[PDB]
Structures are given as C-alpha cells and as structure tokens.
C-alpha cells in the first residue's frame, strides 16, 4: 500500500506542467523517503531529476518500493481536473496496474476519483556523480525565463559566461547579436529578488535555447532558480520546491 496525502496539491499540478512537454513518459520511483524521478528526453540532450520528499506531504505511507511506469501526458490530463486549492491524495497497491488520484475540494462536498492506467517502460537511467561546480548562480526564476525567451528571438544558441562580479547571456543570429549582463546585487534589502554568484573559476558554455525554454516551465514552482556550470559538462538548472524537494534540469553543452 502506498498513500500520500498532499494539502497543497497545486504543487503536483505544477510538477506535471513542467514535465509533460519535455518528457512524455517516465518511471516514478516510490520509496519510504519519498518520490524520485529521472528521465532523459527523446533526444537524450536533456535530463530531468524530480525529488518529492515524504515530509513534504501531509501524510505518507510506503511499505515496499514501487516503480510506476507513468504516461505524463495522461497524468497531466488528469491533474488538469484538479483545482488549485484542492487537496490531492495519491494511492496505489502492489498487484494493481493503476494509480488512484483523489481530489478534495474546499467545500467540503465535492469529491473526485481518478484511476490512471500505468504502462510498461523500457527506459534509460543515468548515473549522476555527486560533484562540486565551478559556477553557481542564484537568480530570480522569472528573470531567467525572460532572458531565455528574449534571446530566443535572436539566435538558436545562448552563451552563458559567468565571472565573479556578473553573469552574461549572449546570442547570435543572422539579424545580429545580443548581450544581457546581470550584475551581482547588494542583498541588503532583499533575499529572493537578488542575483548571487559563487565562483571557483570563470565559466563559458553554449546551450540550445529550445531546451532551456522547455526548462523554464517549472517557473511557477519557485521564485528562485540556480544554475550550476563547469567546463564542458552539462548545465544544472535547479528549481526548489518549498517544504518538499526539488526539480533539476540537466542540459548537455555544445562543445
């Protein structure tokens, strides 16, 4: 028996609104410590790692580990049937090939029951090494999304160049070029609206903007976003899920 009661259900909705466009299908690993997901997109250029820790839920029960082959399209379709203020319960058995989703409205007098068909999956998982990165930039999520959106008008690629005092995003195309320079902020009057940079060595990397534009659909999950970059390795775009866990987008560079 697996049962997770989550009061702030909208979170999960957001989780599915940040995934279903990048990955159509994924394996959801359910354990006593919570929910884990890892999945490359069909082009294997990007990867996603989702973590929803058990303490994030209002209640949580998981006797034995379960691997749920899930169609994220249908799951997003089902989560579309849940309100923002809805309390959502996930429930699954062991000898059952489905996932139950119970939506409770704040009346209380409206109750929804949804049974999602689970599927078979032949997927690839990657071993991700626990490492330290040369550049770590913490910035507003909306700012990053806006930057990617804007530079998407210039070219296909974006050059992220991080120094110690500033982070720059550049783009070049047949109409010309564009440079966006964000300086470090004196966070003497704030905390989340600030742009901070932790640098060991200056880093310069080039990435595909379409994948980043796929990534920035996790913006409603957090007011902040962190970018981890090292030389000639995949970029990590992390969104923190408050009182819950995180969502990480890995993107292979253009060496």
């Amino acid at each position: 028996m697996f049962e997770a009661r989550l009061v702030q259900g909208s979170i999960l909705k957001k989780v599915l609104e940040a995934l279903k466009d990048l990955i159509n299908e994924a394996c959801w690993d359910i354990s006593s410590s919570g929910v884990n997901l890892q999945s490359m997109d069909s082009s294997h250029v990007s990867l996603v790692q989702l973590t929803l820790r058990s303490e994030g839920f209002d209640t949580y029960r998981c006797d034995r580990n379960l691997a749920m082959g899930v169609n994220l399209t249908s799951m997003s379709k089902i989560l579309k049937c849940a309100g923002n203020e809805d309390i959502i319960t996930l429930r699954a058995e062991d000898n059952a090939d489905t996932l139950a989703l119970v939506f409770e409205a704040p009346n209380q007098e409206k109750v929804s029951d949804y049974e999602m068909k689970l599927m078979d999956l032949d997927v690839e998982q990657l071993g991700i090494p626990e490492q330290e990165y040369s550049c770590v930039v913490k910035m507003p999520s909306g700012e990053f999304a806006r930057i990617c959106r804007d530079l998407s008008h210039i070219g296909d690629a974006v050059v992220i160049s991080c120094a110690k005092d500033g982070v720059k995003f550049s783009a070049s195309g047949e109409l010309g070029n564009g440079n966006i320079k964000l300086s470090q902020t004196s966070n003497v009057d704030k905390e989340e609206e600030a742009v901070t940079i932790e640098m060991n060595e200056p880093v310069q990397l080039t990435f595909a903007l379409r994948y980043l534009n796929f990534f920035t659909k996790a913006t409603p999950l957090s007011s902040t976003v962190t970018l981890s970059m090292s030389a000639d390795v995949p970029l990590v775009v992390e969104y923190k899920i408050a009182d819950m866990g995180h969502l990480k987008y890995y993107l292979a560079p253009k060496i």
Binding site: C27, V45, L47, G69, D120, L121, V123, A252, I255
Partner: peptide, 20 residues
C-alpha cells in the same frame, strides 16, 4: 561551438524495464 553533445556522453547509461 562545434557539436551538440548528449547526456550519455557524460553519464553512464543504465537500462531499466518497468512493468505496470
């Protein structure tokens, strides 16, 4: 730039069979 790499050029790929 020169070539768009993939995630499997950096991380080791583990194949998994999930039944449901």
């Amino acid at each position: 730039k020169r070539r768009q790499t993939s995630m499997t050029d950096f991380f080791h790929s583990k194949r998994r069979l999930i039944f449901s």
